[PDB]
Each structure stands twice: as C-alpha cells, then as structure tokens.
C-alpha cells in the first residue's frame, strides 16, 4: 500500500490498479465510470513512485476486472499492474495488453461518421503498427492513428 | 441456404472472393434465364436518404424484375423519418417492421452498418454510404469485367480520374485484389492520386501497380480502362483546365488498344469521355450500367431466397 | 357485404364500437394468416398532399401486402393537381376516375370529408387532416392495446405530453370512451392540458379521469403509458427546458410498473423516451408501428372486398 | 467519523473536504478540475460515517480554498466540512455558504441561450427560495430552478 | 460625464428609474431642439443578425438625425461574418475595431450581453435578443406614456393580448414597476396569460394588478391601453378564432374612455386594432412609433457624448 | 499629383514597391491624423456582386471615415443590374455615370479588370475577384507587418494552412517578394501545398523558402506567423481530421516565440487558432482587421485626391 511514514490504506477484497502514469488516474475514473458504484473506493493521485517519480493508484472494493477489461487500460496506462486482492492478500497480478477492439470510449474523428448523432457505442478495431496504434471505425470504416483519435 | 441468405451487404471488405464469384455466377444465370416471380410477395424498401436517380431506378427495376413490390422515398430534403429529429436508428427500427429488405443510400459513412443494428431479421443492402462503400456498383463492375474478359485474375487494369476521392475505384481495386495476378496502372493528377492506403494494401499482397501521367503510355497493354468523373467542384477552375487533358478520352486515343479492351465509367461521363468513343467496340459503359440490373437482381435473390434454384 | 364495405373512413367519431372491433378482429386474422392476393387488380391512390414518410410507407406497404397496385404523390410543394390553382374537389373528381380507393393526408381540416363529396363510388381513407382526425393511427393504437392487454374495456390508461394539440390522443381518448370502465390519467404541462371538450365528453359518459404532474404518481397502476411528442416549436425554449422533465421517460421510472404495462408513442420519440427504455419489456412503440401494417391492411380489405373470407 | 481500519493518513499542509454526500465526490473532482495539479491528492468514495450512512472525502495538499471557493461547493455538498492546513493540524474548519453567484460549472437549460455556441463561461445569480435555489443566467436573463439546471 | 456615457444598453433590468428619466428628459429636449451634428464623424454599426425593418429603419433614422454615418447589414442569409462557424465573439471583436457603437438585433437570448464582453471600449445597444430584452422599444413606450400622461407614476395601465410571449409587455411591466402607485389590468386568453414570474415581481413590490376578461371592465379608468399582437403562429387556427374577440379593439369600445386615455401598440397590429380606431383622439400607436426616433436619438447621444449641452 | 491619383487598384502585380510604401505611409498618417472631411461630396459605390460582410463593412467604414457618401448592394440574388443577361460591362458603364469610384467584389476572376475598361474616368478598386486578387487585404496585411515589425525587408515569414487555394497568401508572398532578404517557411498538408508557380517566382528572385511539418520547427525565428483558414469544403471529412493537428495553433506553441513575433490571420479563424492565443501579446488578428480601415482609407484618399496634405 502507499506507505510513507504514518497511516496506510490496504483493502480486504477487490481490485487495485497500480502504477497508472500521472494525470491518467482521473481519466480512467472518467472514461470507465469507475465511481458509479456503491462499493468503497480509495484513490491516490500524484503519489511518489521511484519506479518513475509519480503515479496514480486506484482501489475498488468487491470489484474485479476481466482480462478483457484490463486490456481496455492499454492505451492509457500501458505499464500498470492490476491486483486482485481477496481476504487482504494479492492473489492476482496482471498487466494490460493491446485488445483487438476498443468500444464506447473513443470518438470517431470523421465528423461525417454516422456514429455521432446516434444511439450506438463507438467501436474501433485495434491495429498495432509497430510505431503507433491504428484504429479503424466499425461504422465509417476509416482508419486513424490512435494519436488523432485520442486528441478528440 | 445459399451462403448469402439473409446476409447484410454493407462492404466489399466483408465479402470473400467466393462471395463475389457466387454473386456474379447468379447474375449470369438470371441474365440468361429470368425469374420474374422469384420474389413475388416480398416487399422491399428503396430508401434513398440521399437522392441518386441512376442507382435507385436500377435497384428498383431489379426488384420488379424478380416480382417484388417496392415502397420507398428519396431526396431527404427533410424526410422527418430519416434526418429531421428522429435518429436513423429509430427510422430503421420502424422500417424494419414493414419490409423484407432495405436498400439504402445515405450521405454519412457507416449509415448502412448502423441500420443493420436496428433492422432485426431484415437484411440491409448498402446503395452508398458517404465516401465509404458502394458494394453493388463494384459487383456490377466485376460482373462486367468477368463477362467481357472471361475472368477476374491476371488482368491489366487501368484506373483514370479522381482516384483520390472515388469510393468506386477504391473498392473495385480492393475487390480485384482478392483475385490473382492483376496488374494496376493509375493515371491521375497529383492532387487526386490513388490514396496511400490502397497502395500499401497492394504492396502487402505483393500486387503490381504503377503510376502514369497519361493513358497513351499504357493503352496498348490494358484490358480494362476504368474512367471516373473528376469532380470539377473540388479543383480550382484553372487547375482543372490545366489538368483535364490527361484524364479525358477521345476515340483517337484508342488506335493502340487491344481488341478485347473495354472502357468502363460508373457515370455520369461527360467531361471525361468524348461522345466519339460511343461507337467504338471499346465503349462499354452503357452495357456496364445494364449489368447493374443483373448484379442487383443476383444480390436480392441470394439474400431473400433460401436456396438458389438456378 | 361486411359493414365497412365501400365505406369512407374519415373520422373516429363516425365509427361504432362494433366497427372498431371488426377492424381489430380483421387485423388479427391478417396478421395470423396473410392474404397477399386479396386486392390483386385494385389500384390505390396514396395522395399525401402533406408529406409524411412514416405514415405513407406504412399505408403503401399494407396495400402491397394485399397485392394491390399503388399510384400517388407527396410533399405538395406545389403539386398543380392538389394545391396550386385547382380545387381539391377537382383534384378528387379526376383522381376518382383512375383508382379504386384514395388514401389521403392533407394540411387542412375536413379535406378528407370534402374528398368524399367528389369521389363518387370511390372510398376515401383519411391518413390525416390537419389537427382534426387520423383514424388509422387510432386503429393501430387500439389494436396494439387490445393485443397486449387482452381487451379494450376496464383499463388504466395514462396519456402524457402535448395533450392539448395532439390529434392522436384526442381520438384515442374518444375511441376508448366507446368502451366501458376505462380510467384515464392525464399528465401534461398546464400550457398543454387535455382540452376541456374531451373532459366534458368523459364526464357526460360518466368516465373517470384525473390530472397528474408526473408519471411516478401513477406508474404503479397503469396498463398503458401513451406518450406524445411535445412540439418544441410551440413553447419558448426556456419554457420547454423548465417543463420537459415531467414529460420524459427513462428506464429508472419503470421500477414501479405493472408487468403487463406497455409504453406506446405514435413517434417520433427522441425528446420524450430515453433510449434506455428500448430494452425493457415495456417498450412497445416499434411493435406498435409494426401493427400499423395490420390495421391498415384490415381497413383496406374491409372497404375494398365485399365479404371478408377471413 | 474516525476509522479503526486502514483509512487515509493526513499530511502536513493542505485542505480536506469531508462529509461530501455519496456520488458527489467525483462530480466535485470533475466540475472543479481538482486533479489538474501535481500536488498529492487522496480520495475516498462511499465511505461510512455516523450521520449519513455513506460519504465521500477528498484531500489535496499544499492547496487552500477561499471562502468563495468553498462556497462554490454549496450546491453539491451543502453540509460538507472543508478543513484546512499546516504542520499536521486542522487550524481551520468551514461549511459551504450559498454564494451570490456561480460561474463556469453550470450549463444554461435554455437551448436558445447564446452561452452555448460561444467562448464564454457560464454565469448564474443564486437566489434561495423555500424548497429550492433559483439560478438566473447572466446571458439570457432567464431564471430556473436549480433542480432544472443541475438536471443531467 | 452623464451617467450613461460609454455605457452598454442591454437590459431594462440594468437601468434604474433615474436612468430611465434621464433618457426620457433627453428625448424631450432633442424632440424640441434637434442637434443634427451632435454625432458628426461617428460611425455606427447597425447589425441586424435578425432582420427587423421597422426597428432598423427607426434606429438608423435616429443615427442620421444626429449626423452620424451608418454601416451594417440585416438577416444573415446575406452575411459571411459568422456563417459557417465564426463565433459571434469574433464577429464583434472585428466590428468593434471599426465603429464607435454597435446596435444589434439577434435571435439568441444573451447575444447583446456576450457582445459587450468582446467589444472593448465600444458601446453595445441591444435592439432585441430573442425572447429576452428590447430596451429601446420599452424606452420609446415609456417616453410615449410620459409625454401623453405627464408622469410614469400612479397610472392605470391595461395590457391586452399575448401577455405570455410578448417580451415587449414583460419589459414595460418591469420598467413601470420601478415607479410608484401604478396599477395593472391584464386581459388575455388563459393560454397567453401574463407569466407568474412577472406577477410575483409585482407582488413582491406591493403593486396592484388584476385579470379581466374584457376591455369593458377597465375602460372607464384606464390611462394607457397597451395592445400587443397575438402570436397565432403558436396557436391552433380554431383556438385563435374562439378567443380573438376578447382581444380586439373597435372604436365603439372607447365610448367611456377618459379624455387623457391613449391606445398604444408596438405594431404591427392587424387583427387587434380595427382601423376605425385610428381617427379617434385615443389612437396613439403611430405617434408611439414616431417617438422611437427621439428615444433612440437620446440613447445614442447619452452613450456617445460626455455632456450634453441640451 | 501623387502616383496613385485616379489609378485603378486591381492587382498586387501592378503595384511597385514604391506604390506599396506610399499606401502604407499614408495609412500611418491617417491613423495618426484623421481627415474626416477629405472626401466630403464624393459618392462611392460599394458593389458586392459577391457578398462579403467583413470586407464590405470595413471598406464602407473607411469611406465614411473620410466623409464620403456610399451607395451599393451585396449578393446578386438581390440585384437586377445583370440578373437575366445584362453584361457586367453595361452594369459598369451605368454605375460609372453615377459615382466617383467603384469598389467591387465579384465571383469571376478578371471582373475588376474588365470593369476598368468600361468605367471611363472612374477608378475601380478590386475588393476580390474569384481566386485571383484581393489587393486591399494584402495592403492591410503589409501595413500590419510594417507597423509591428518596423520593416518589410529581411523578415522571417511563416505561412500556415491552406497555401494552395488561399489567394490571400499568394498575394502576400508576391508582395513581400518585392522587398529584400525575406525568408519564407511554408507549413501545410501535402494536399494544400504552396503552389509551384509561387515557388518558381521565389526561386527566380533568389528568395529563400523551405517547407516544414510543424510550427515548432520555425517558431524560434519567426517574425510573422500568418495563419489561413483551411477550405475543408474541398477536403474529405476524414482527410481533414488526419492533418488538422499540424495546422492548428494553441498558446503553448508560442513558448519560444521572439518578443516581436505576431500571429496574423485574415479571418475567420475557427479551428486554426485556439482562443487561448487571443490573450497573448502575439495575437494580432483583430488589430490586423482594424488596420484594414487605415489601409482602405489611404487607398481611397490617394486615388481620389491629387495631393494629400498629410
Ligand atoms: N490488502 C491489500 C493488499 C495490497 N494492496 C495494494 O496492492 C498493491 C501492490 O502490492 P504488491 O503486488 O503485494 O507488492 P508491490 O511491491 O506493490 O509489487 P510491485 O512492485 O509490482 O507494484 C499495493 O499498492 C498495495 O497498496 C491493497 O490495496 N490492499
Ligand atoms: N492532519 C490531519 C487532520 C485531519 N484530517 C482530516 O480532516 C477532517 C478532520 O476531522 P476531525 O478534526 O478529526 O473532527 P471530526 O470527528 O471529523 O468532526 P468533523 O468531521 O465535523 O470536523 C477529517 O476528515 C480528518 O481525517 C486529515 O486528513 N489530516
Ligand atoms: O452511384 C451513382 C448514382 P449518382 O449519386 O446519381 O452519381 N452513380 C455511380 C457513380 N458512383 C459514385 O460513387 C459517384 P456518385 O457520388 O455520383 O454516386
Ligand atoms: O402521422 C405520423 C406521420 P408524420 O407526419 O411524419 O409525424 N406519425 C404519427 C404521429 N401522429 C401525429 O399526428 C403527429 P404528426 O403531426 O407528426 O403526424
Ligand atoms: O421586435 C421588433 C422588431 P419588428 O419585427 O420590426 O417588430 N420591434 C418591437 C416590437 N415588439 C413586440 O413585442 C411586437 P412583435 O412580437 O411583432 O416584435
Ligand atoms: O475574402 C474576404 C471577404 P470575407 O468572405 O468576409 O472573408 N476577405 C479576405 C479574406 N481572405 C482570405 O483568404 C480568407 P477567406 O478564404 O475566408 O476569404
Ligand atoms: Zn467513424
Ligand atoms: Zn442562459
């Protein structure tokens, strides 16, 4: 747990997303609507790291993430580690890996794409291009750099 | 049932080489032996949120040639059930409780794919979705190439005009790239060159292609000369004046042509093909438009009739 | 012949409870057992002097499902035979020498009744006449209520939205008032309350009704929650902002709902029904639109076919 | 509302927003861009308390809030306690008072308000009424019930 | 410098009783002693984003009567300063580098206020911003009341017509309520009633107001009978026809009017004041419009000159 | 008489470095010492065959600041002087018998030049002729460069955006190239590149220019960063979205800018300059527009008065 020199926050059971780069923790909570629950949540932002210098930490009680759900974290916190804690001890440790699809959170940059005025969830097929990631809209079939899609 | 029974026809990229061949073989059969009652009792929606007289008449005629009934609309200058306030989703959710299939053309990319998510068991056929896909134009183009050249493999295909924005040349190129040994020649103004992504797609498949400034460089080895309309509105009047010459055809440019060569153009032509070309045995753009009826009939039959008693 | 053979269908007020039941029973039969050749050889005019894509497609589809042919027009942006100089009388006098029946929607009240006086032996079916009647929308609404609730007597019906100007809620209310024991709840902004004349009509028949500020007050005892579109154009933007909340539905407002409860909306919805409602078993507005085909088929069959071999 | 388990320590200097109603903590962090800083932050959501059942708590160090800024939380956490300061101790405690004006975070419900398509910050005059708060837009001069303005 | 020097004139809510008096005292002085060169060398922008011939002609005439030059435009079907996305903010940042004052009318509420945030040193005068304000119409109304009645205190003011949506009557009520002893009579169909927020404002200041069905009930005591146009465009044609009679004025209705009584109307009238009223000594709507010139001249003179030698 | 007395102002190609200097020296003098009566009794036609609110307001304000009267029109949807076939030639032969100078904007290239052939003794000032010229925009641009930088020689000028179709940047490049030691940096998508004819012109005069992908590469040395609007109307929505990022300016991009550096934009901006740039000391696009008035006044004063006592 974030141990410094006094009170430290450990949890009984649930999940712990660690090593989120700085200024990405609030984004994850936003994008993935993590706080829309009655489960207890503990969050530390700009925490000291050494494994870098700073970082964000997210703890969600009585909530676990599928491997697929962990992969959605790949574009924003590639180097994170998601911890499964039950009965107070880490039973699981996983890292996100590029998923094949990113749904709901990205917005298609093509302004004429039908996805915009409509009741559908965005969806892009993921294509690592050994330099960046390519996102192809399920609807307009246009492909863009993740750097452009993430700008919007 | 046949492989395409009850399937949505949205994008050439979702169709296999076998799917293409099946559509073409069915088209040839219907051309040779008509089935005016095949879709008797089917009611089809011809929904042109974006008006397109040539494509709509062609599709509707195909529906009637199989005996199906047609309901529909066009020029969505408003069309409250289409663009106004109501979502396309809601428009499709309603339309799909009335008809057996939906043929739709829309100004926004992905419209047909979106329709597919609200149409339930009702197949949707994409007649044009923005600058994205137009699968039936490509099917009638392939059918026309297969019919006049005897095959779809090992051809010398030249594409001329606005290769940059032409959704039709983009997909004909992708469709021919599912076959083997085809060689491409791309004749276009720098401002309107075949996009890099189609180029990358061809290199990856190890398919040969070259760029040429004019038709004459290649006229002697082409089996198909596919011309496209250079949208004047895009270019500056002066720019268009300075560049139009290399992208327009006269009969005199054909002295060189192979006997088997056919000139195709999705239409309208007018600024790119001189009318003196019409009389040559190479002119094949009107026969090409006629083949739209056989390709669209094949597609509707395959999608709406379980087996194809062909 | 059947009671409606060759009759004009202009206003819900000219239809008896038995007439309504007969239409609904015929609709159920055609839904269960289709008759694609019933009106073979009939030619019907689909005359939309006032464009209305959802209603026109629905009616035309119904015509085709019975095998009838269709001629017609829409968006009378002019339509020289319709609004320009020529009287509606003269337009009908001509149209009635061509077709077997006339389905018409017009922007002026009484248009269909006027048509009736110049159509000779040709039946006219009212698809909408200004803010007056829209009998086939009411028939598909009743059919949808009968089908989902098992009857049309002793129901708890809530009507929400623009009860003041909604011609559809006015006539559904009058039609349900021909049946017994129905109880009404009217949820609407003061500026858009159910008119006094419908209220007077109900008191005279001794029928119960109450006013409520929001859906939640009544959600637990309603069998049908009929929503209507609040025309934004009527209200001041700010006024609409301050009042919209009580007249819009989310799935969370349904926690309370009876299992049998269905939500209806003549469409388009968009500003009054959140899309999260679509997935509940209560959402029934698209099934309701689908029933328009069975109700319109029943009506055309009864009016154009002497007996109903049902 | 102490905590006999593993809560949150409590640094030298900063501000602690306590007694935040449930499902208002995150809203506060977004609306007021609380995480757009490099200072260490610590958040607790859906925590238990002895007078609310559940509550949200936020801690931001080396950061202080004026009586105006604390008043800006009034619409969301009317009974919160902003606690301030240095050398490990609460030298200041304040409750949100309703401000005379609220800028930037609200959205005018009037769809015809010019505020919507333009490079301006929303602005409302606050007026307390029996049963609710009246919010009057600076631009269109229309006044609405806060329940309507705060309406999603 | 006078209190209004270089001040923005956006809302009647921002003007104190003394400000109102100042403008009106200046209007009387310029009506009696014109200063055709007061603003020579000043250039003023007449920016009618929303077209309004009557208001624009009036305001521009006032500008010329003081010697100022004018540049501007009307409607934005004919405008490229904010057509495909330029913000109103940028349009004003540009224009304010050109002119000495901006007079603007716009379809969105708050537009004049937003303009002041980008016009720097340049005063903005609101000529109407959606359903919010129209301060110079109120100023011209007050000047007319003051001129014909000799005071703005202790008046019997009746307001008739569409009190719900008339921004002109809301503003005049707010303005008159800044003075003492005024009593209001509101005569309007229940559907177009003076809004509750105005009534609450009156209640809070202890100002007496009462509702009446007909002009007859208050004629004997009315000092100003302020008629408004009915926005029948929001009403049902039949609805309009049922109540119009109670909000229409004929000369015979004026039989027991006080000698000092005046009939005002912001115009256009049409169905609300019969032409036989025009000849009576009470008709004062054309004199009211002529007064927009002195009220508008006063406003420009106060805002653009430090001290008026009047 | 001064060199520009009674001269037509049609193209920057017709103006020598000394002509440019003369106009700019006059603009500085009138900006410092206004002459509100210089052109009293002159009537000037503001003929906007093609509507342009920003340019017309600017030009008409300049006319009034010198005391001239103005008559004119905008767009020709609202014009009968050349509507059903009257030639531009006849329209000008008529107008030139009325006024002292003609300011005109027109959709066809060469229109101002043709006008000079029919206007006799009356000078014509080109306010924009299709994709050809816009001399007063260039003059206002140069005045702004000269005023903020103190010279037109030896500058580091970057041009960003749509360099292919911006007639404004072609003209400014041509103008700046009449001075010595200027160096250009062109930053634009390959599809909207500065045209080769401009590059050739620069080469022929030994003027250094270079292409750069991002503003970052030249910020440290730029004196004038001239931003242009991207004509996305010719582009593909997706195409636009892929490159826009490299032609958009945020305040953070200005961190290493020279103290003297200025950001200019002919307007409207929208997607190219973020509003956070407006507050920096480098934002100079609104001051640039305000300068159109002094550049436009200078031009009218030079052309209409023999000798200016400035
Ligand atoms: N009951 C527990 C147990 C552990 N943790 C959290 O689990 C995370 C990871 O701890 P752990 O994997 O056991 O050891 P580390 O040193 O953190 O591993 P690494 O260096 O890869 O991060 C820590 O942030 C700790 O706060 C927790 O919140 N509650
Ligand atoms: N050095 C400190 C001191 C206090 N706090 C927090 O600031 C608030 C102070 O609470 P406290 O002074 O102990 O009194 P309470 O019992 O919480 O009563 P109240 O909440 O009404 O102030 C609590 O959230 C506490 O955890 C902190 O984080 N660090
Ligand atoms: O699809 C059509 C019908 P139309 O819209 O009238 O050109 N014609 C074939 C040419 N195909 C194209 O994609 C060009 P266009 O955008 O004109 O359809
Ligand atoms: O009749 C229709 C067709 P449309 O005119 O497109 O709304 N829809 C059912 C809603 N009924 C109404 O009377 C409202 P509307 O005036 O939109 O028809
Ligand atoms: O609004 C304007 C401009 P105009 O459209 O010329 O009447 N003048 C003030 C009139 N005020 C009114 O409330 C009457 P109306 O509702 O017709 O604008
Ligand atoms: O062309 C005009 C008249 P306006 O349409 O008001 O911008 N002014 C000069 C701006 N020059 C440009 O190159 C920018 P734009 O291409 O928007 O005209
Ligand atoms: Zn897309
Ligand atoms: Zn507002």
Q: Where are the beta strands (DSSP E) in chain B?
A: 43-48, 69-73, 101-106, 124-129, 156-160, 183-187, 209-212, 224-227, 262-264
Matching residue, tokens 């858009």:
C192
Q: Please choose, from the candidates E17, E18, E23, E11, the residue with its C-alpha nearest in 3D space to the C-alpha of residue E301.
A: E23
Ligand 5 interacting residues, C-beta cut-off 6 A? E 52-55, 128, 134, 137, 166-168, 229, 266
Contact assignment for D9 to A6 by CB distance below 8 Å = yes
Mutation choice for ligand 2 from D6, D12, D83, D91, CB with most ligand atoms inside 8 A: D83
Q: What angle do CA C41, C42, C48 make, to 5 degrees?
A: 145
Residue D148 contacts residue D105 (beta carbons within 8 Å): no
Largest pairwise CA distance in chain F = 57
In total, chain A counts a number of residues equal to 152
Tell me which of A114, A134, A137, A142 to substitute to probe the interface with F (most F C-beta atoms closer than 10 Å).
Answer: A142
Q: Which of B55, B91, B116, B168 is catalytic?
A: B55
**Interchain touch B–D (≥3 Cβ pairs closer than 8 Å):** no
In chain C, what residues touch B98 (CB-CB under 8 Å)? Answer: 57-58, 61, 290, 293
Q: Indicate if D54 and D41 belong to the same structural domain.
A: yes
Establish whether B205 is a catalytic residue.
no
Q: Indicate if A64 and A127 belong to the same structural domain.
A: no
Residue B236 contacts residue F233 (beta carbons within 8 Å): no
Matching residue, tokens 């955006």:
F161
Question: How far is C10 from C25, CA to CA, in rounded Å?
Answer: 20
Question: How far is C126 from C135, CA to CA, in rounded Å?
Answer: 7
Experimental resolution (Å): 2.1
The dihedrals phi and psi of C59, each to the nearest 5 degrees, come to: -65, -45
Whether D148 is covered by a domain: the verdict is yes
- Would you call C233 an interface residue with chain D, using a CB distance cutoff of 8 Å? no
Question: How far is F46 from F41, CA to CA, in rounded Å?
Answer: 16
Q: Please choose, from the candidates C259, C230, C254, the residue with its C-alpha nearest in 3D space to the C-alpha of residue C242.
A: C230
Whether A115 is covered by a domain: the verdict is yes
Q: What angle do CA B206, B209, B215 make, to 5 degrees?
A: 165
Whether A47 is covered by a domain: the verdict is yes
Question: How far is B187 from B200, CA to CA, in rounded Å?
Answer: 17
Both tokens assigned to C254: 């349904």
Both tokens assigned to D114: 């010019």
Q: Indicate if D113 and D39 belong to the same structural domain.
A: no
Whether D1 is covered by a domain: the verdict is no
Domain that holds residue A77: 7-99
Q: Which residues have C-beta within 8 Å of that of residue B71, sequence separation ≥ 6?
A: B43, B44, B45, B46, B98, B99, C57, C60, C61, C64
The closest ligand to the CA of A86 turns out to be 1
Atom of ligand 4 nearest to the CA of C53: 6
Q: How far is the centre of ligand 7, averaged over its atoms, from the C-alpha of B130 (Å)?
A: 11
In chain D, what residues touch C240 (CB-CB under 8 Å)? Answer: 111
Q: Is E56 annotated as a binding residue?
A: no
Both tokens assigned to E265: 């109307």
Q: How far is B40 from chain A (nearest CA, A)?
A: 33
User: Where do breaks (C to N over 2.5 Å) occur in chain B, by preceding residue number?
Assistant: none
Matching residue, tokens 């926005």:
E231
CA distances from D18 to B169, D47, D48, D68, F5 (A): 63, 10, 12, 17, 77
The dihedrals phi and psi of A43, each to the nearest 5 degrees, come to: -130, 130
CA torsion, points A63, A67, A68, A74, in degrees to nearest 10?
100
Question: How far is C212 from C195, CA to CA, in rounded Å?
Answer: 15
Contact assignment for A22 to D38 by CB distance below 8 Å = yes
Both tokens assigned to F264: 């200019």
The dihedrals phi and psi of E101, each to the nearest 5 degrees, come to: -165, 150
Q: Indicate if A66 and A119 belong to the same structural domain.
A: no
Question: How far is A142 from A134, CA to CA, in rounded Å?
Answer: 10
Q: Indicate if D89 and D118 belong to the same structural domain.
A: no
Question: How far is B128 from B110, CA to CA, in rounded Å?
Answer: 10
Neighbouring residues of the ion ligand 7, judged by CB less than 5 Å:
A 108, 110, 113, 137, 139-140
Q: Indicate if D20 and D93 belong to the same structural domain.
A: yes
Helices F167-176, F196-204: axis angle to 10 degrees equals 0
In chain D, what residues touch C245 (CB-CB under 8 Å)? Answer: 148, 151
Both tokens assigned to B169: 């040349």
The dihedrals phi and psi of A133, each to the nearest 5 degrees, come to: -115, 140
Q: Indicate if D105 and D32 belong to the same structural domain.
A: no
What is the CB-side half-sphere exposure of residue C220 using CA atoms within 13 A?
3
Both tokens assigned to A109: 């940059």
- Would you call D150 an interface residue with chain C, using a CB distance cutoff of 8 Å? no
Pairing of strands A133-137, A123-128: antiparallel
Question: How far is A123 from C289, CA to CA, in rounded Å?
Answer: 30
Q: How far is A11 from chain B (nearest CA, A)?
A: 42
CA distances from B70 to B78, B287, C165, E286 (A): 21, 25, 34, 61
Report how far apart the first and last C-alpha atoms of chain F are (Å, whole number).
Answer: 14
Question: How far is B110 from A111, CA to CA, in rounded Å?
Answer: 12
Structurally, chain D folds into a number of domains equal to 2
Question: What is the phi-psi region of residue E68: left when phi exceeds 0, alpha when psi lies from -120 to 50, beta otherwise?
Answer: beta
Q: Indicate if D139 and D89 belong to the same structural domain.
A: no
Question: How far is D149 from D129, CA to CA, in rounded Å?
Answer: 15
Q: Indicate if D81 and D13 belong to the same structural domain.
A: yes
> Which chains contact E through at least 3 pairs of Cβ atoms less than 8 Å apart?
C, D, F
Q: Indicate if A62 and A11 belong to the same structural domain.
A: yes
Q: Indicate if D19 and D85 belong to the same structural domain.
A: yes
Establish whether E17 is a catalytic residue.
no
Structural domains of chain B, ranges and CATH numbers in brackets: 1-133+292-310 (3.40.50.1370), 134-291 (3.40.50.1370)
Both tokens assigned to B197: 């992504």
Residue C82 contacts residue C105 (beta carbons within 8 Å): no
In total, chain F counts a number of residues equal to 310
- Would you call F82 an interface residue with chain E, using a CB distance cutoff of 8 Å? no
Whether D113 is covered by a domain: the verdict is yes
Q: What CATH number should be reported for the domain holding residue D104? A: 2.30.30.20
Q: Indicate if D17 and D91 belong to the same structural domain.
A: yes
Establish whether B105 is a catalytic residue.
yes
Atom of ligand 2 nearest to the CA of D12: 1
Establish whether F232 is a catalytic residue.
no
Pairing of strands D14-20, D53-61: antiparallel
Q: Please choose, from the candidates E265, E261, E271, the residue with its C-alpha nearest in 3D space to the C-alpha of residue E289.
A: E265
DSSP for chain F? --TTTT--B--GGG--HHHHHHHHHHHHHHHHS--TTTTTT-EEEEEESS--HHHHHHHHHHHHHTT-EEEEEESSSS--SSSSS--HHHHHHHHTTT-SEEEEEESSTTHHHHHHTTSTTS-EEEEEETTS--HHHHHHHHHHHHHHHS-SSS-EEEEES-TTT-HHHHHHHHHHTTSSS-EEEEE--GGGPPPHHHHHHHHHTT--EEE-S-GGGTTTT-SEEEE----TTTS-HHHHHHHGGGS-B-GGGGTT--TT-EEE--S--SSSB-GGGTTSTTB-HHHHHHHHHHHHHHHHHHHH-SS---
Establish whether E55 is a catalytic residue.
yes
* Cα D93 to the center of its chain, rounded Å: 15
Four-residue CA torsion sign, F297, F300, F303, F306: negative
Whether D2 is covered by a domain: the verdict is no
Tell me which of F57, F59, F105, F266 to substitute to probe the interface with E (most E C-beta atoms closer than 10 Å).
Answer: F57
Q: What CATH number should be reported for the domain holding residue A62? A: 3.30.70.140
Question: How far is C177 from C165, CA to CA, in rounded Å?
Answer: 19
- Would you call F51 an interface residue with chain E, using a CB distance cutoff of 8 Å? yes
Question: How far is D47 from D30, CA to CA, in rounded Å?
Answer: 19
Question: How far is F273 from F262, CA to CA, in rounded Å?
Answer: 13
Q: Please choose, from the candidates F221, F218, F173, the residue with its C-alpha nearest in 3D space to the C-alpha of residue F198.
A: F173
The dihedrals phi and psi of A42, each to the nearest 5 degrees, come to: -125, 125
Q: How far is the centre of ligand 5, averaged over its atoms, from the C-alpha of E262 (Å)?
A: 20
In total, chain C counts a number of residues equal to 310
Closest CA to ligand 5's atom 5: E52
Question: What is the phi-psi region of residue D65: left when phi exceeds 0, alpha when psi lies from -120 to 50, beta otherwise?
Answer: beta
Buried b (16+ CB within 10 A) or exposed e, D8-38: bbbbebbbbbbbbbebbbbbbbebbebbeee
Whether A84 is covered by a domain: the verdict is yes
How many Cβ atoms are within 10 Å of F47's Cβ, its own excluded? 27
Q: Please choose, from the candidates F264, F235, F229, F234, the residue with its C-alpha nearest in 3D space to the C-alpha of residue F247.
A: F229
Helices C285-304, C17-32: axis angle to 10 degrees equals 100
Question: How far is C4 from C24, CA to CA, in rounded Å?
Answer: 13
Q: How far is C242 from chain D (nearest CA, A)?
A: 6
Whether A2 is covered by a domain: the verdict is no
CA distances from A100 to A34, A133, C244 (A): 22, 11, 41
Residue C268 contacts residue B80 (beta carbons within 8 Å): yes
Matching residue, tokens 């169709």:
B15
- Would you call E89 an interface residue with chain D, using a CB distance cutoff of 8 Å? yes
- Would you call C239 an interface residue with chain D, using a CB distance cutoff of 8 Å? no
* Cα E287 to the center of its chain, rounded Å: 14
Report how far apart the first and last C-alpha atoms of chain A are (Å, whole number).
Answer: 35
DSSP for E35-95? -TTTTTT-EEEEEESS--HHHHHHHHHHHHHTT-EEEEEESSSS--SSSSS--HHHHHHHH
The closest ligand to the CA of A8 turns out to be 1
Closest CA to ligand 5's atom 2: E55
């Amino acid at each position: 747990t974030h141990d410094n020199k006094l009170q430290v926050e450990a949890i009984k059971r649930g999940t712990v997303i660690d090593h989120i780069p700085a200024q990405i923790g609030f984004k994850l909570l936003s994008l993935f609507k993590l706080t829309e629950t009655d489960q207890r949540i503990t969050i530390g932002l700009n925490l000291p790291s050494g494994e870098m210098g700073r970082k964000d930490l997210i703890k969600i009680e009585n909530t676990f993430l599928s491997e697929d759900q962990v992969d959605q974290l790949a574009l924003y916190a590639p180097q994170a580690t998601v911890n499964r804690i039950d009965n107070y001890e880490v039973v699981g440790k996983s890292r996100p890996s590029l998923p094949e699809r990113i749904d709901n959170v990205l917005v298609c940059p093509n302004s004429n794409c039908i996805s915009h005025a409509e009741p559908v969830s965005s969806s892009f097929a993921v294509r690592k291009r050994a330099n960046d990631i390519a996102l192809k809209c399920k609807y307009c079939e246009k492909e863009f750099s993740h750097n452009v899609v993430l700008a919007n | 049932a046949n492989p395409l029974y009850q399937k949505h026809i949205i994008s050439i990229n979702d169709l296999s080489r076998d799917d293409l061949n099946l559509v073409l073989a069915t088209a040839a059969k219907l051309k040779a032996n008509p089935q005016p009652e095949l879709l008797k009792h089917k009611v089809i929606a011809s929904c042109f949120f974006e008006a397109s007289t040539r494509t709509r008449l062609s599709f509707e005629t195909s529906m009637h040639r199989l005996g199906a009934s047609v309901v529909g609309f066009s020029d969505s200058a408003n069309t409250s059930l289409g663009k106004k306030g109501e979502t396309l989703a809601d428009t499709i959710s309603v339309i799909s409780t009335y008809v057996d299939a939906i043929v739709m053309r829309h100004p926004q990319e992905g419209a047909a794919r979106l329709a597919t998510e609200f149409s339930g068991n009702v197949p949707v056929l994409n007649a044009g979705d923005g600058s994205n896909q137009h699968p039936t134009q490509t099917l009638l183009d392939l059918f026309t190439i297969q019919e006049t050249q005897g095959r779809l493999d090992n051809l010398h295909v030249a594409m001329v005009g606005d290769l940059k924005y032409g959704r039709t040349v983009h997909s004909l190129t992708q469709a021919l790239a599912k076959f083997d040994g085809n060689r491409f020649y791309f004749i276009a103004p720098d401002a309107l060159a075949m996009p890099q992504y189609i180029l990358d797609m061809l290199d990856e498949k190890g398919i040969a292609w070259s760029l040429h400034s004019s038709i004459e460089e290649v006229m002697a080895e082409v089996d198909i000369l596919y011309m496209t309309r250079v949208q004047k509105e895009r270019l500056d009047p002066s720019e268009y004046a300075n560049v139009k010459a290399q992208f327009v055809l006269r009969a005199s440019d054909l002295h060189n042509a192979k006997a088997n060569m056919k000139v195709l153009h999705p239409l309208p032509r007018v600024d790119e093909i001189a009318t003196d070309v019409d009389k040559t045995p190479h002119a094949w753009y009107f026969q090409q438009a006629g083949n739209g009826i056989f390709a669209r009939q094949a597609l509707l039959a395959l999608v709406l009739n379980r087996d194809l008693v062909l």
